[PDB]
Amino acid sequence: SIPKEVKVAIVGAGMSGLYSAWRLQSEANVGDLAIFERSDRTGGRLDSDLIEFKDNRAGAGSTITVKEEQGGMRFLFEGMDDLMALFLKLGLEDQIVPFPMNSGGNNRLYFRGTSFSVNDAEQDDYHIWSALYNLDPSEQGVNPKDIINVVFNRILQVNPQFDSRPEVRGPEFWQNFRLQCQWQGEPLYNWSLWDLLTDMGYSQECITMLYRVLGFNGTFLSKMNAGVAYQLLEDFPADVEFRTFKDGFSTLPNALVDKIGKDKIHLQTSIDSIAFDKADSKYVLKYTKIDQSGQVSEGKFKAEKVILGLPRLALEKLFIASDAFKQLPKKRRDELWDTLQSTSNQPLLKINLYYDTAWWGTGMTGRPAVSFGPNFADLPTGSVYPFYALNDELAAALMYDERHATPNPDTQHKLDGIDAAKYARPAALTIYCDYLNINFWSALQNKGELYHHPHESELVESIPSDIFPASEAVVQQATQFFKDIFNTHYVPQPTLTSARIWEGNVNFNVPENLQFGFGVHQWAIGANDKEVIEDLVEPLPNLFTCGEAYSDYQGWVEGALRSTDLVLQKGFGLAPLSEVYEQDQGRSSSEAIQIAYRKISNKMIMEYIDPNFS
Amino acid sequence: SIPKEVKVAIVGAGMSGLYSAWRLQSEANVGDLAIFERSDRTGGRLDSDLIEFKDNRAGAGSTITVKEEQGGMRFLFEGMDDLMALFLKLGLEDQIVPFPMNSGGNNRLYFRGTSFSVNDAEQDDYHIWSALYNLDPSEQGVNPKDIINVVFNRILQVNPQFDSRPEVRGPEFWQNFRLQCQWQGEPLYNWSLWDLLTDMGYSQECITMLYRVLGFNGTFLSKMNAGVAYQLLEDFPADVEFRTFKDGFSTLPNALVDKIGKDKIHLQTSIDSIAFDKADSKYVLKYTKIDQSGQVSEGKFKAEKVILGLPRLALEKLFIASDAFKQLPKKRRDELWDTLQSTSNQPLLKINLYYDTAWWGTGMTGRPAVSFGPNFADLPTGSVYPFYALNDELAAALMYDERHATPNPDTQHKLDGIDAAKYARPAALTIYCDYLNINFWSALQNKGELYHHPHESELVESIPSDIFPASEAVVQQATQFFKDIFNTHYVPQPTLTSARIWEGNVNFNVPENLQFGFGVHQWAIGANDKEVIEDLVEPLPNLFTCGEAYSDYQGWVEGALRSTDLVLQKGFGLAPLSEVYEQDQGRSSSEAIQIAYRKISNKMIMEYIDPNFS
Ligand SMILES: Cc1cc2nc3c(=O)[nH]c(=O)nc-3n(C[C@H](O)[C@H](O)[C@H](O)COP(=O)(O)OP(=O)(O)OC[C@H]3O[C@@H](n4cnc5c(N)ncnc54)[C@H](O)[C@@H]3O)c2cc1C
Ligand SMILES: Cc1cc2nc3c(=O)[nH]c(=O)nc-3n(C[C@H](O)[C@H](O)[C@H](O)COP(=O)(O)OP(=O)(O)OC[C@H]3O[C@@H](n4cnc5c(N)ncnc54)[C@H](O)[C@@H]3O)c2cc1C
Ligand SMILES: N[C@@H](Cc1ccccc1)C(=O)O
Ligand SMILES: N[C@@H](Cc1ccccc1)C(=O)O
């Protein structure tokens, strides 16, 4: 049942769409709104899976749950003030757990046919990098990641006009960085990182090493500009403490759906075109809907205000098909189109292989155990992340680990036991790659038959609907790269697989359950994003645009929230959520979340790890 | 003056457009046609430059001409039967000269920070490749290019149903190859070459070596399918004898313009949209024109039949904007759009740096002289090709070289002198790269000020209009890669530069003199090009499509000619030019051209090289 008219029509049930609705209902007393989502699910590029494995351990119809992510997976307590405020208002802080990023040096590295560990790579003044890559002398004997850091320090040094003092470097800092810092008299948003490092004197061997060692080679090889590249590369410092949700990032959009009401959310309802009815000064939205039978249906409805919570490709499709846009004067039509081109499309993919037990621990490899964080490679895998069965005791040990406490031998012995026990429960690996590596897997995923473990139904009760199996060809090639990376003959067949290629589609032959947008976006060369962003808040009277793609904090939920807040301010009078939170609470979202989590983790530790913890 | 109506409207003055017009006038008695070209020039992706350098040698207002190419540059006597027939009918055979592809082993190779020669790489059972790349044992001790050849032989071996016997392997053979040969039960057009070699057991190190050593990394890293990849990779065998035109490939389209008449050719006239007038059963073409003042102008005219001699991107623009296409039923509209997606867009670029003298000969390097053919590198240059001042004596020596004659010491001594003399005349290097390397140069080309040698006007009289200078940043980075590749401290500043990035544009901010299509196209994964090709001949009644992009012989003029011939057959009754040539002449275009060139080169040799030659 699609209403004949609403006061606010929201297009897209991703974070931007759900967040708009929630804030409008809760703070602007707007009850007459509706959300229209082309897919059969909410959340967009947040997409968690909770798999209930048959527990077939010896002493066990009992079930073990493995959380995995097909989209976003992690966040930070600082520099994400809207997100934190959002978590606190929805009361989700008690589900926050660690997202560790290292195994104390045991994580794998695979480069130029050679498998080794992070610890190994440090040995002998980082000698291994100078053996694998033909580096200039000034490039030898230093940790590759530290080259990125040093170059960052150099950019700041030669831009003394640019105030580099704030301790928390959020979207503002990063915008001024790319728009006002220069190199050789050209501001960074006119640079590519590839050109920049080359101009600075780096060898192409060194540059290849960097874009392979860092995982996201798009920062170097795509059309994104060097300033925004650096915002992403300086997001994963050595000392990072990322967190996530026990049940996955989808906890967040599922919570918003609850507050919104499923009755206002129209799934399998794609907005095809938008026109303006000059008589009653209202927009007219043409849609297509698929009921639960397959019964297709076309229709139309009106809205006083329209909120397009949509990325670049989706906006371009609407723009091309929409009289509201076509009726515009030539000059402004073309200017608006050119503005949509100012953010690069960044493909990403995640392929998840689940296993009845984990095989990368010392028991199965005979080598130092791999636990958490990226296993990087110049293979097409890009980055490989382990996930483990949900386990409260394990999460507590990880919480203890987030402190830089010195356990006594009793506590170290218990932590040892907990670290080893996770290998005996179901687990998963995520292959997580970008740009240059996409095409290897997409051709593999669409060829031949799909993978299913025999007796799959005996292994997992219900397989979530958003799971499309990896192709048999994907599993076989992934299995061989895993043997390379983890330096082991032993990599068994997965119990369950999923493949998700976040690469926008323009082909009408693709089912709706397989149409996905680009993974993230990043400002292109020459893009003055300060102008672009304000231009896209409300490009036509009462029609708004918002989301990650043209945001301040690309690649992250926080960017979607901040871009949406701009729409909520200009079109509805609402101040930014983080400022509203601080007005209502007397303190920042950031301080609040840290105090609340500290308390939760304090008691988690005392209860599971060390009864006498500080 | 744009006619109110024509019987045939031809859109695009590239090879397909000019060739359509010429054959229609000459063979179908169609005089009432006109060509409409959006740019200020004919020829499209064929674009030669003839630069007249001030001759500032000691004993010399005399001029020296350097031919260069910004687009296509070479052809073959076999497997290009339409092109050869076309050359013969236009009487252009006497301007055909060699296009040599090697320097007897002295061409440069630069990989993983190491500069060496083709001869060097052969040494010690191809040891250098096993030192630079961490190869499997089965991958060691073999010439990299021979891995591609061997794998080709393996594909044929396991497809005995596929008749692999014809000596001249033209478009038909290559189509059946990619559509009917399989690997592991999947036909090649469902494969990517990257996936294919990986599945066959090759190391990623070996695969990286191959796509770097072979120049065109798009065959591996793009979305083109493995079958068409192989058509391109098996086009440059060791023993190739390419030819070209003394004054450049544009000799061909300039000759067609002459036969057509400039009066039927409408430059700076872009067709924006197409509609069908059901009353008088005629198409209505909306255009925009820019006179010689900058005076813009919009208008409309009708045509009985429309020939779109246009590549993928240009066709998609028209399709989106055209009522003739929009009025189509949903199902067929989407099917036609999806069909346009079946050929991948392959960016290419050429950056030409001209020098008053050549600096890569032994006199200037102290190393074995570099003469002709690609200098490959894993640097962003991709491939570097030398060009020399036009010189009849040099062309004769090259003609002698095409024979595998054994000169006596008198003839060898003269050839030695001729080889060395070309270094003392103006010359040029072309940087010629694809896919992965494009983004490095485009960001560099659009940053900062453009390069001009001081006193440029004293060095070259008139600079052709199609020359856009390379950026200063492009020249500085090219200069350093040249020192790397040619292993020399000495690389002077160029007298003149051009940059051409064959990468399609969707941004209204780009001048028309800087809008260029994608370099070439190649069938995508899953594309049944036999179905696609016939579907695109005449997608609407009396509206036709033709050109390289959706052709049988992608990457080459011959593909444009063959795709156009299909339009000439279906819509106008003309048989293929090569069959028409053979009917009129009693022998094939291929035999004719070889005999005529043999005669021309025979007399060229006797006159310049060896008075007593066989
Ligand atoms: C692989 C990956 C990992 C990530 N990891 C993280 C992470 O760890 N941390 C983090 O903070 N961020 C992460 N992100 C980013 C984060 O997921 C996104 O920034 C955010 O979820 C996107 O929200 P959005 O509302 O802007 O767009 P989307 O999530 O893309 O929502 C747009 C919605 O609109 C719908 N739609 C499109 N067109 C139409 C139409 N015509 N009619 C109706 N509906 C339509 C789409 O189906 C979709 O649901 C990740 C992203 C990717 C790709
Ligand atoms: C770098 C490079 C090197 C190459 N080297 C070789 C080689 O050595 N040998 C070889 O055989 N082939 C070579 N090729 C391929 C060869 O140049 C092409 O296959 C052929 O010239 C293309 O002809 P076409 O008519 O299909 O298209 P195009 O040459 O692209 O012609 C299309 C024309 O239509 C015009 N146009 C577009 N849209 C409109 C519109 N709306 N209204 C009006 N006009 C419009 C364009 O300006 C253009 O002039 C090379 C190609 C590239 C990119
Ligand atoms: N939040 C993203 C960050 C990202 C942005 C852009 C590209 C890739 C990654 C992540 O965790 O992976
Ligand atoms: N004729 C092209 C062949 C080619 C096709 C496709 C891509 C690249 C090159 C050339 O000489 O370069």
PDB file of C-alpha atoms in Angstrom, chain B residues 216-326:
ATOM      1  CA  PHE B 216      48.808  -3.952 -23.146  1.00  0.00           C
ATOM      2  CA  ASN B 217      47.935  -4.879 -19.570  1.00  0.00           C
ATOM      3  CA  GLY B 218      44.240  -4.358 -20.405  1.00  0.00           C
ATOM      4  CA  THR B 219      44.202  -7.840 -21.947  1.00  0.00           C
ATOM      5  CA  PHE B 220      44.732  -9.152 -18.376  1.00  0.00           C
ATOM      6  CA  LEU B 221      43.359  -6.533 -15.994  1.00  0.00           C
ATOM      7  CA  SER B 222      40.284  -5.110 -17.814  1.00  0.00           C
ATOM      8  CA  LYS B 223      36.846  -6.699 -18.260  1.00  0.00           C
ATOM      9  CA  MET B 224      37.593  -7.928 -21.821  1.00  0.00           C
ATOM     10  CA  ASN B 225      37.202 -11.644 -22.271  1.00  0.00           C
ATOM     11  CA  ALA B 226      40.099 -14.051 -22.683  1.00  0.00           C
ATOM     12  CA  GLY B 227      39.182 -15.049 -26.249  1.00  0.00           C
ATOM     13  CA  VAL B 228      39.413 -11.542 -27.654  1.00  0.00           C
ATOM     14  CA  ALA B 229      42.447 -10.862 -25.444  1.00  0.00           C
ATOM     15  CA  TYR B 230      44.171 -13.656 -27.356  1.00  0.00           C
ATOM     16  CA  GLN B 231      43.221 -12.181 -30.743  1.00  0.00           C
ATOM     17  CA  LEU B 232      45.175  -9.080 -29.734  1.00  0.00           C
ATOM     18  CA  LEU B 233      48.150 -10.853 -28.074  1.00  0.00           C
ATOM     19  CA  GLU B 234      48.760 -13.143 -31.061  1.00  0.00           C
ATOM     20  CA  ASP B 235      48.840 -10.118 -33.381  1.00  0.00           C
ATOM     21  CA  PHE B 236      52.515  -9.178 -32.799  1.00  0.00           C
ATOM     22  CA  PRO B 237      54.518 -12.357 -33.570  1.00  0.00           C
ATOM     23  CA  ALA B 238      58.301 -12.251 -33.619  1.00  0.00           C
ATOM     24  CA  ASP B 239      58.426 -12.311 -37.435  1.00  0.00           C
ATOM     25  CA  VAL B 240      55.839  -9.545 -38.024  1.00  0.00           C
ATOM     26  CA  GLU B 241      56.355  -7.180 -40.933  1.00  0.00           C
ATOM     27  CA  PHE B 242      54.024  -4.258 -40.295  1.00  0.00           C
ATOM     28  CA  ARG B 243      53.811  -1.434 -42.806  1.00  0.00           C
ATOM     29  CA  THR B 244      52.485   2.108 -42.613  1.00  0.00           C
ATOM     30  CA  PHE B 245      52.209   5.193 -44.829  1.00  0.00           C
ATOM     31  CA  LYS B 246      55.147   7.563 -45.322  1.00  0.00           C
ATOM     32  CA  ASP B 247      52.959  10.530 -44.326  1.00  0.00           C
ATOM     33  CA  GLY B 248      51.008   8.649 -41.666  1.00  0.00           C
ATOM     34  CA  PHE B 249      47.759   6.706 -41.439  1.00  0.00           C
ATOM     35  CA  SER B 250      45.738   9.899 -41.999  1.00  0.00           C
ATOM     36  CA  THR B 251      46.790   9.553 -45.671  1.00  0.00           C
ATOM     37  CA  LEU B 252      43.841   7.143 -45.819  1.00  0.00           C
ATOM     38  CA  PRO B 253      40.971   9.325 -44.479  1.00  0.00           C
ATOM     39  CA  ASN B 254      42.387  12.397 -46.246  1.00  0.00           C
ATOM     40  CA  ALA B 255      42.209  10.411 -49.496  1.00  0.00           C
ATOM     41  CA  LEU B 256      38.585   9.463 -48.787  1.00  0.00           C
ATOM     42  CA  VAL B 257      37.693  13.087 -48.051  1.00  0.00           C
ATOM     43  CA  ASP B 258      39.092  13.997 -51.479  1.00  0.00           C
ATOM     44  CA  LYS B 259      36.838  11.499 -53.269  1.00  0.00           C
ATOM     45  CA  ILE B 260      33.831  12.434 -51.133  1.00  0.00           C
ATOM     46  CA  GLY B 261      34.027  16.208 -51.391  1.00  0.00           C
ATOM     47  CA  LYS B 262      34.387  18.563 -48.446  1.00  0.00           C
ATOM     48  CA  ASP B 263      30.967  19.996 -49.387  1.00  0.00           C
ATOM     49  CA  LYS B 264      29.217  16.863 -48.030  1.00  0.00           C
ATOM     50  CA  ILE B 265      31.218  16.899 -44.768  1.00  0.00           C
ATOM     51  CA  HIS B 266      29.892  19.025 -41.895  1.00  0.00           C
ATOM     52  CA  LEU B 267      32.538  19.614 -39.225  1.00  0.00           C
ATOM     53  CA  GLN B 268      31.785  20.959 -35.733  1.00  0.00           C
ATOM     54  CA  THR B 269      28.260  19.570 -36.176  1.00  0.00           C
ATOM     55  CA  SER B 270      27.294  17.106 -33.458  1.00  0.00           C
ATOM     56  CA  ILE B 271      24.116  15.038 -33.759  1.00  0.00           C
ATOM     57  CA  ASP B 272      22.436  15.421 -30.366  1.00  0.00           C
ATOM     58  CA  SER B 273      19.239  13.374 -30.746  1.00  0.00           C
ATOM     59  CA  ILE B 274      17.271  11.351 -33.284  1.00  0.00           C
ATOM     60  CA  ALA B 275      13.511  11.003 -33.700  1.00  0.00           C
ATOM     61  CA  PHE B 276      11.263   9.305 -36.254  1.00  0.00           C
ATOM     62  CA  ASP B 277       8.585  11.277 -38.132  1.00  0.00           C
ATOM     63  CA  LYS B 278       5.888   8.624 -38.689  1.00  0.00           C
ATOM     64  CA  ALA B 279       4.046  10.769 -41.256  1.00  0.00           C
ATOM     65  CA  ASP B 280       6.673  10.831 -44.033  1.00  0.00           C
ATOM     66  CA  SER B 281       8.578   7.802 -42.607  1.00  0.00           C
ATOM     67  CA  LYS B 282      11.800   9.744 -42.083  1.00  0.00           C
ATOM     68  CA  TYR B 283      14.258  10.237 -39.244  1.00  0.00           C
ATOM     69  CA  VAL B 284      14.641  13.700 -37.717  1.00  0.00           C
ATOM     70  CA  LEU B 285      18.170  14.584 -36.563  1.00  0.00           C
ATOM     71  CA  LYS B 286      18.666  17.395 -34.073  1.00  0.00           C
ATOM     72  CA  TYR B 287      22.138  18.885 -34.152  1.00  0.00           C
ATOM     73  CA  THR B 288      24.282  21.661 -32.722  1.00  0.00           C
ATOM     74  CA  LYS B 289      26.782  23.483 -34.927  1.00  0.00           C
ATOM     75  CA  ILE B 290      29.613  25.932 -34.266  1.00  0.00           C
ATOM     76  CA  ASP B 291      30.532  28.081 -37.262  1.00  0.00           C
ATOM     77  CA  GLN B 292      34.041  29.539 -37.660  1.00  0.00           C
ATOM     78  CA  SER B 293      33.188  32.488 -35.369  1.00  0.00           C
ATOM     79  CA  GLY B 294      32.129  30.534 -32.304  1.00  0.00           C
ATOM     80  CA  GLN B 295      28.536  31.289 -33.310  1.00  0.00           C
ATOM     81  CA  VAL B 296      26.669  28.311 -31.864  1.00  0.00           C
ATOM     82  CA  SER B 297      23.529  27.163 -33.668  1.00  0.00           C
ATOM     83  CA  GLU B 298      20.889  24.468 -33.212  1.00  0.00           C
ATOM     84  CA  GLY B 299      18.747  22.878 -35.875  1.00  0.00           C
ATOM     85  CA  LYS B 300      17.037  19.848 -37.321  1.00  0.00           C
ATOM     86  CA  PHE B 301      16.886  17.907 -40.574  1.00  0.00           C
ATOM     87  CA  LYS B 302      15.546  14.660 -41.956  1.00  0.00           C
ATOM     88  CA  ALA B 303      17.038  11.533 -43.480  1.00  0.00           C
ATOM     89  CA  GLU B 304      15.563   8.462 -45.112  1.00  0.00           C
ATOM     90  CA  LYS B 305      18.379   6.274 -43.740  1.00  0.00           C
ATOM     91  CA  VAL B 306      20.800   6.992 -40.880  1.00  0.00           C
ATOM     92  CA  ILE B 307      24.299   5.501 -40.571  1.00  0.00           C
ATOM     93  CA  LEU B 308      25.799   5.827 -37.073  1.00  0.00           C
ATOM     94  CA  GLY B 309      29.526   5.279 -37.611  1.00  0.00           C
ATOM     95  CA  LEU B 310      30.048   5.638 -33.887  1.00  0.00           C
ATOM     96  CA  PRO B 311      31.662   3.772 -30.948  1.00  0.00           C
ATOM     97  CA  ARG B 312      30.030   2.620 -27.713  1.00  0.00           C
ATOM     98  CA  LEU B 313      30.027   5.845 -25.724  1.00  0.00           C
ATOM     99  CA  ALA B 314      28.780   8.012 -28.599  1.00  0.00           C
ATOM    100  CA  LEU B 315      25.996   5.491 -29.297  1.00  0.00           C
ATOM    101  CA  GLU B 316      24.950   5.462 -25.636  1.00  0.00           C
ATOM    102  CA  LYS B 317      24.731   9.265 -25.569  1.00  0.00           C
ATOM    103  CA  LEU B 318      22.495   9.301 -28.651  1.00  0.00           C
ATOM    104  CA  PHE B 319      20.422   6.379 -27.340  1.00  0.00           C
ATOM    105  CA  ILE B 320      19.673   8.186 -24.064  1.00  0.00           C
ATOM    106  CA  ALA B 321      18.732  11.455 -25.759  1.00  0.00           C
ATOM    107  CA  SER B 322      16.769  10.072 -28.746  1.00  0.00           C
ATOM    108  CA  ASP B 323      12.990   9.712 -29.002  1.00  0.00           C
ATOM    109  CA  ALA B 324      13.502   7.139 -31.750  1.00  0.00           C
ATOM    110  CA  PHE B 325      15.046   4.989 -28.995  1.00  0.00           C
ATOM    111  CA  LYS B 326      12.955   6.153 -26.023  1.00  0.00           C
TER     112      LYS B 326
END
